[PDB]
């Protein structure tokens, strides 16, 4: 009966744990001992984007590493010119309650969605000049928390109904749906190869998926609280997650376990965003303590503090070329570090 | 600066629009609806006329109200309640026909982001509770309570029980009783909002 199935599941979980422990020959910090530290990584506020009036919730860099799109609960989505600090597009939204935004790698479309259970798609290159709504991805049950782009057609979204979904912008239908989580899926990160993507969910576990087949490949445990943000390592062979337990963890796809956990007794705030550098040496992770720290990804040691915000940071993402490190926070100010 | 001057011109021309839109939108009084399932929030929001957030807005006595009914978000409220940190007042409803909403009230009033917001409590379904008390004693829903069994005292006792969950002096629970058949809700909301506006404005200037 169901007891036999439960016993089989327990045996399978024990086998998975034994296999994962078998491959743990040594810790990451054991191997990375003989590498010289990065020293002080202090950065200064080179630019400041003083254009918002309410809390800023997301900021995604453009493909050319010069245009930044910021989504705020003031009811506007603004595309920032990071060099001249000018505003190039002010997009009035439908529902002011937004929680994520995305810049397409082609630089044509901008996706913004939130508590309205709709992941809107905006067209920047309209021949009429003004930005218009090209599609409204209705169909979700819970709130949409993270949207990312594969191309100008296929957009992957994560919501609070424990399900992620691959959409087709040209048709407005859920081409593929993903299930297996038991809580609100809050974060998403498409891999550089655009064939895999991991999702962070409020079940304190991170799950990997395949975009084409649509079947979950692996699962990762260890977090004691909900995962608030996640991102791939630039090499595509690892990913780091930031949970509300004031810890940042590093997981390897080919190891199926946790590599290093970034923690400090001083910090107890809730991590809200993580992002690597171009070379994978620095993991700039946000915090709820009004300051964004900088973590040496290999030595698991702090390198500097990016303080300067009057409130908690909500997003921190580096550019494609790795020249700047943008931040966004609840104080309606976006600061560009370097 | 060949044509970048025109870029700066456009940037200023839309920064002005952002500032004007924000100033215009600051005139609205944000309100948040809350309560249990079938707890009478729908009828009170329908009395003023006009599955994500269902926003209802109405203008009453030169004030523009915005009501946010979040009953459609059947998810973990911990991850999205902070979006309403700037709400002027929380409108919380409890049906007296059924104790089940006490935990929800405690969670809302003890929440970190709502330590300075005034929870306008409503007690709807007055006549149903009265008829239930007239038929059966009010002690059925409150086994601990063994006081006088009358509607006029049971209502006061339940109001005291709900108000006992407050833990801060900066917020005042403007209780009220409704029977889902009177248009007195608007006046109570208006009076409470005026009081909260006065309190917040005085606190901002340091006089409070």
């Amino acid at each position, epitope marked *: 009966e169901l007891d036999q199935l439960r016993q089989e599941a327990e045996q399978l979980k024990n086998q998975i744990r034994d296999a994962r422990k078998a491959c743990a020959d040594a810790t990451l910090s054991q191997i990375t001992n003989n590498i010289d530290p990065v020293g002080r990584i202090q950065m200064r506020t080179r630019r400041t984007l003083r254009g918002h009036l309410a809390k800023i919730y997301a900021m995604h860099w453009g493909t050319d590493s*010069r*245009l930044l799109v910021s989504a705020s609960q003031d009811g506007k989505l603004i595309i920032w*010119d990071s060099y*001249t600090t*000018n505003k*190039v*597009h002010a997009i009035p939204l439908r529902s002011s309650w937004v929680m994520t935004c995305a810049y397409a790698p082609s*630089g044509n479309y901008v996706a913004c969605g939130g508590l309205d259970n709709i992941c809107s798609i905006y067209n920047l*290159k309209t*021949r*009429e*000049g*003004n930005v218009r709504v090209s599609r409204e991805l209705a169909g979700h049950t819970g709130y949409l928390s993270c949207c990312r782009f594969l191309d100008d057609n296929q957009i992957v979204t994560s919501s609070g109904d424990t399900t992620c979904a691959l959409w087709d912008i040209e048709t407005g239908q859920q081409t593929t749906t993903f299930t297996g989580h038991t809580g609100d899926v809050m974060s998403l990160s498409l891999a550089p190869d655009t064939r895999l993507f991991v999702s962070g969910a409020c079940d304190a576990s991170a799950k990997l998926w395949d975009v084409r087949e649509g079947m979950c490949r692996q699962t990762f445990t260890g977090h004691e609280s909900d995962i608030n943000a996640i991102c791939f390592f630039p090499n595509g062979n690892a990913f780091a997650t930031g949970s509300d337990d004031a810890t940042c963890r590093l997981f390897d796809l080919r190891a199926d376990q946790e590599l290093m956990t970034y923690s400090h007794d001083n910090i107890i705030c809730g991590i809200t965003s993580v992002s690597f550098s171009k070379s994978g040496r620095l993991l700039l992770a946000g915090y709820d303590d009004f300051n964004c720290n900088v973590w040496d990804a290999l030595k698991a040691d702090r390198a500097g503090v990016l303080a300067g915000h009057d409130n908690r940071v909500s997003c921190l993402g580096v550019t494609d070329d790795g020249m700047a490190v943008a931040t966004g926070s609840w104080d309606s100010f976006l600061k560009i570090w370097n | 600066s*060949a*044509e*970048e*001057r*025109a*870029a700066l*011109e*456009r940037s200023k*021309a839309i920064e002005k629009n952002l500032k004007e839109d924000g100033i215009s939108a600051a005139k609205d009084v944000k309100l948040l609806l809350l309560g249990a399932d079938n707890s009478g929030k729908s009828t009170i929001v329908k009395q003023m006329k006009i599955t994500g957030i269902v926003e209802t807005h109405f203008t009453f006595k030169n004030l523009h109200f915005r009501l946010f009914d979040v009953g459609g978000q059947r998810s973990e409220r911990k991850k999205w309640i902070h979006c309403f940190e700037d709400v002027t007042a929380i409108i919380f409803c409890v049906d007296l026909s059924d104790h089940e909403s006490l935990m929800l009230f405690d969670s809302i009033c003890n929440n970190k982001f709502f330590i300075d917001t005034s929870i306008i409590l409503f007690l709807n379904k007055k006549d149903l509770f009265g008829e239930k008390i007239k038929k059966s004693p009010l002690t059925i829903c409150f086994p601990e309570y063994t006081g006088p069994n009358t509607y006029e005292d049971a209502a006061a006792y339940i109001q005291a029980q709900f108000e006992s969950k407050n833990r801060s002096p900066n917020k005042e629970i403007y209780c009220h009783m409704t029977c889902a058949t009177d248009t007195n809700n608007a006046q109570v909301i208006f009076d409470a909002v005026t009081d909260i506006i006065i309190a917040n404005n005085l606190r901002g200037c340091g006089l409070y």
Partner: single-chain antibody
Amino acid sequence: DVQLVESGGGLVQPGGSRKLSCSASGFAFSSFGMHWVRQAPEKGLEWVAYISSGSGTIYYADTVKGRFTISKNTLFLQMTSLRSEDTAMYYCVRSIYYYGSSPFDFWGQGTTLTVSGSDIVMTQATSSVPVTPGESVSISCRSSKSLLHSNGNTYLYWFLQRPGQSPQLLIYRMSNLASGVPDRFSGSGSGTAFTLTISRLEAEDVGVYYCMQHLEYPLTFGAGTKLEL
């Protein structure tokens, strides 16, 4: 579709006044900065005026300022004190300026009007290049100053004017290609010398080619190369 129709031109006695107007539809004209470009009956294009979005900054050409005034969805060029040298065909042109924008990306049908100093001069080496279909062609244009600004954007624009039609943009900022133009066209250069390259020249791509810069006002055009069949 996008349409820029205009009227008000015609024959007028010298010394009078006339009000040529441009009508805009199909796009958010309120966020667009309309220009005004004219071409003599037997010469090349000549920049005339410019008004920005929101009526912010208004410019005029050296031989224009004083008698021309530029001011829903309608652009006005109120004109007075008309002399015999003013006769030309005036084109209504739109443009928006932001990062990666496409200025001068659309031209109106034009109107016909007849009368009874330190500028960056631009000249073209050849004014006539015979060519046959299927063979690559090339047009050249040179300036009097380097167009390469400090930020690296060489404000050199290329325009194509098929006979009996309004000009259509082909290359903007000397390296980018507009929308709707086939990938056969190309533009390249360095500082002062510009070359427009066409590979596998189709018959429909016949017409005169005009060269423009946008580094400073007035926007002096070139003499125009008539790539003829």
